[PDB]
Amino acid sequence: MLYLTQRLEIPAAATASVTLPIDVRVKSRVKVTLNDGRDAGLLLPRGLLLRGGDVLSNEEGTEFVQVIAADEEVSVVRCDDPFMLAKACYHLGNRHVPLQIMPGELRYHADHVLDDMLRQFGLTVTFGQLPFEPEAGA
Amino acid sequence: MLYLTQRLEIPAAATASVTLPIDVRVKSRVKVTLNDGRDAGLLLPRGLLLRGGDVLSNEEGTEFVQVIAADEEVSVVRCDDPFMLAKACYHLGNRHVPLQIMPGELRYHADHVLDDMLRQFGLTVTFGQLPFEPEAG
């Protein structure tokens, strides 16, 4: 039974693979079927951030699996007006809502109350099944 | 004494004014000093936010006091890259920091800890003595 351990920075062979949510990419240690086929456990230190593209490796180095942010039910906000988005970011952080931030776009786990709070800013909120990479801050 | 009890939606020619910082402007019941030296007691409806430009009057409609946001010690954050400002807003709100948000310009009570924290994000912080008007949520 192969078990993942250390996390390298160097993006080696993408021959192996695994796809997990944000929920599990902060467990440091767990197990479920993978993408390369070969099931495997986990051995990562405390308080680690696993990002889409972040390669992993074992003690032997024979394998270099890759972590992939699985699609997750999220609310997506797209606007080309930084101000309207800035305001939003403020109020979401004020409720400690894990949020993904990119130019012209925001992502947070689907929640209608939040969608209505954002629509109250004249923002368009649409549902999506996409990878969720919220801001570093657990 | 003199009591200001209403905030007329309808403007009017001001007969006086009182300068006040945000902490006071959130206070419904309080004794203040008009800029002409007279003492007036604010007795407006509870839970109301006084903004600069607000005009308070009395029952008899014989006094129209204009609220002026007092100059406060604030840090000012800018960046030609608007996307950089957003992340700062998210973190500031995470810490529940009163914040004034304008297009390409943030403002908050000067605090050196927050300043460094924002420089990390690579934001240039500046200082000013300006009227502070934080978001109300």
Swiss-Prot record, chain A:
Its cofactor is Ni(2+). Binds 2 Ni ions per subunit. GO terms for cellular component: cytoplasm. It is found in: Cytoplasm. Keywords: Chaperone, Cytoplasm, Metal-binding, Nickel, Nickel insertion. Disruption phenotype: Disrupting the ure1 operon causes loss of urease activity. The keyword Ribosomal protein does not apply. The keyword Cytoplasm applies. SUPFAM superfamilies: Urease metallochaperone UreE, C-terminal domain (SSF69737), Urease metallochaperone UreE, N-terminal domain (SSF69287). GO terms for biological process: protein folding; protein-containing complex assembly; urea metabolic process. Its main location: cytoplasm. Ni(2+) 1 binds at residue 96. GO terms for molecular function: nickel cation binding; unfolded protein binding. It comes from the Bacteria. Homodimer. Dimerization is prevented in the UreEF fusion protein. The artificial UreEF fusion protein binds nickel but is not able to transfer it to the apoprotein, thus its function is impaired. UreF function seems largely unaltered in the fusion. Involved in urease metallocenter assembly. Binds about 6 nickel ions per homodimer. Probably functions as a nickel donor during metallocenter assembly. Its function can be bypassed in vitro in the presence of high nickel concentrations. This is Urease accessory protein UreE.
